[PDB]
């Protein structure tokens, strides 16, 4: 559970925002890419796994689960690549409401940034610092620290 | 000291690798950019501050310290922008041996990657997971979680 992440891909402004969510805390990392290819997904996961101890990734769709480039990055970085079938139906709704939350935040900042990538990173910042009480960024550090100890 | 980071800019292959080091742990984040500009430095700091609780950044040179764009991102993200003067002369040496270490690692992976950006992220991953024993990625989570508690 400290090591479990979920990929999520949402669209805005004719571009693609790829998100990784740490399931137990709700902490996120995200980037803007022009399209969701195995090469872009693979690089994103290599970045994530060098920053946090990523044990398993639930992929966002079957193309990224099938992609040999994505499996090559998960092999390189020591990640268990898994499907993202919502066996617990609560997952679909949680992801959908996180996407709606992030798009709401992005609209609230959007005129402070010329480029969408800036607005998405301001939205990641606001999401991870929001106290709901602790923030997701506090929760992820507590969880992984408890696991290390 | 849980909140203090140092910027560092090194070059390879005609490109610039911008690095942020968390001083108390030695954990790093890095990216490849075509040139150091205030705009690229500012966006890197926005990314870093949405992922870790960045209180102070010691800038890598006087152009990034002077840059109004960098100061604007430090204002946005709540970061105290400071100079990088090595009042403790041990800092110069630590940074230099970190860049030599990263370049060493990059050479050891370089032929597994077509693009330098992949190699630099493989080197971030190896640096942060290396046990010297706790790793830098273990030390940063411990330090921050101890601070939150």
């Amino acid at each position: 559970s400290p090591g479990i992440w979920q990929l999520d891909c949402t669209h805005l402004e004719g571009k693609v925002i790829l998100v990784a969510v740490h399931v137990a805390s709700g902490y996120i990392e995200a980037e803007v890419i022009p399209a969701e290819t195995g090469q872009e997904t693979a690089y994103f996961l290599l970045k994530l796994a060098g920053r946090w101890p990523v044990k398993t990734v639930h992929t966002d769709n079957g193309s990224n689960f099938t992609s040999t480039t994505v499996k090559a990055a998960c092999w390189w970085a020591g990640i268990k690549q898994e499907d993202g079938i919502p066996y617990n139906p609560q997952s679909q709704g949680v992801i959908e409401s996180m996407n709606k939350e992030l798009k709401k935040i992005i609209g609230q900042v959007r005129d402070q940034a010329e480029h969408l990538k800036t607005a998405v990173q301001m939205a990641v910042f606001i999401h991870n610092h929001k106290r709901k009480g602790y923030s997701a960024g506090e929760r992820i550090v507590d969880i992984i620290a408890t696991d290390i100890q | 000291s849980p909140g203090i980071w140092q910027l560092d800019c090194t070059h390879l292959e005609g490109k610039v690798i911008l690095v942020a080091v968390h001083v108390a742990s030695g954990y790093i984040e890095a990216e490849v950019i075509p040139a150091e500009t205030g705009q690229e430095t500012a966006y890197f700091l926005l990314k870093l501050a949405g992922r870790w609780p960045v209180k102070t950044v010691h800038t890598d040179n006087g152009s990034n310290f002077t840059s109004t764009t960098v100061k604007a991102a430090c204002w946005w993200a709540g970061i105290k922008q400071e100079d990088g003067i090595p009042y403790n002369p041990q800092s110069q040496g630590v940074i230099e041996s970190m860049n030599k270490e990263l370049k060493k690692i990059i050479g050891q992976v370089r032929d597994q990657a077509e693009h330098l950006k992949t190699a630099v992220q493989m080197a971030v991953f190896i640096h942060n997971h290396k046990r010297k024993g706790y790793s830098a990625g273990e030390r940063i989570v411990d330090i921050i979680a101890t601070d939150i508690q």
Partner: peptide
């Protein structure tokens, strides 16, 4: 071309 980021 036999690389992680370019398997071809």
């Amino acid at each position: 071309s036999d690389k992680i980021d370019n398997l071809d």
